[PDB]
Amino acid sequence: TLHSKSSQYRRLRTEWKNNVYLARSRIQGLGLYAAKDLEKHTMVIEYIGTIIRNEVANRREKIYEEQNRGIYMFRINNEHVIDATLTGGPARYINHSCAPNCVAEVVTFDKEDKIIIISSRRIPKGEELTYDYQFDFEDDQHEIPCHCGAWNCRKWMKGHH
Ligand SMILES: Nc1ncnc2c1ncn2[C@@H]1O[C@H](CSCC[C@H](N)C(=O)O)[C@@H](O)[C@H]1O
Ligand SMILES: [Zn+2]
């Protein structure tokens, strides 16, 4: 079926290169933009990387912090993180917004769990892609100023300089 989840994912693997482009962000550093008008609830790009445990992720983040380099991770849940720092794709440049246009959802395809960035509304060509990073207050991580610039911006987020 053309509109099934598995078919959407299969189309994603061939189309994602045409959905997005990397450019200077209107938020911070580099960001990811819609290369074309994207319909609502459409799969945009997969957050690829290496699935690791919290223990492993915290040890990696220390390693990275000692280098002059960005850290690129997506937390799936309390147990696992996708580390995109070494093996990620352009989805790792997607910035946080307190008022985002995309959502990240787990999708299972041929025996694997995947994080797919999905539009939560129509996105015009040239608009920056964002999702909400999901920083819970219960300690866990550090936190930096948020510069997403939205009206309801919580002024803080999880991350690094
Ligand atoms: N709304 C926002 N406000 C401030 N910093 C942000 C942000 N969204 C993303 N970032 C920064 O981007 C990182 C997440 S990865 C996003 C890619 C990053 N902009 C880059 O050019 O490499 C975090 O370390 C954070 O510092
Ligand atoms: Zn914000």
Numbering used by the authors: 5380 to 5540
What are the paper's exact sentences on this?
The final construct used for structural determination, MLL4(tag), encompassed residues 5,384 to 5,536, followed by a C-terminal 6xHis tag, and crystallized with S-adenosylhomocysteine (SAH) cofactor product. The crystals diffracted to a resolution of 2.2 Å and belonged to the space group P21. The N-flanking region of MLL4 forms an extended helical structure, and is markedly different from the extended loop observed for MLL1. The C-terminal tag immediately follows the conserved Cys4Zn cluster and enters the substrate binding channel before turning and passing over the cofactor. The lack of methyltransferase activity observed with the C-terminally tagged construct can be attributed to partial blocking of the substrate binding channel and interactions with the cofactor. In MLL4(tag) the SET-I region, which retains the conserved fold observed in MLL1 and other SET domain structures, is in a position that is more consistent with the “closed” conformation proposed for an active SET domain (Southall et al., 2009). The consequence of this position for the MLL4 SET-I region is that the four-residue motif, termed the channel tetrapeptide (I-Y-M-F in MLL4), is 3.3 Å closer to the conserved active-site tyrosine that flanks the target lysine side chain (Tyr5512 residue in MLL4) relative to MLL1. Inspection of the MLL4 structure reveals that several side chains of residues in the postSET loop are oriented toward the SET-I region, and some are capable of making hydrogen bonds with it. From this we infer that when associated with WRAD, both proteins adopt a similar optimal conformation when fully activated. This implies that the structure of the isolated MLL4 SET domain, with respect to the positions of the SET-I region and postSET loop, may represent an intermediate state, which is partially stabilized by features unique to MLL4.
The activity of H3K4-specific modification enzymes, in higher eukaryotes the MLL (or KMT2) family, is tightly regulated. All contain a catalytic SET domain that associates with a core multiprotein complex for activation. Here we show that, unlike MLL1, the MLL4 SET domain retains significant activity without the core complex.
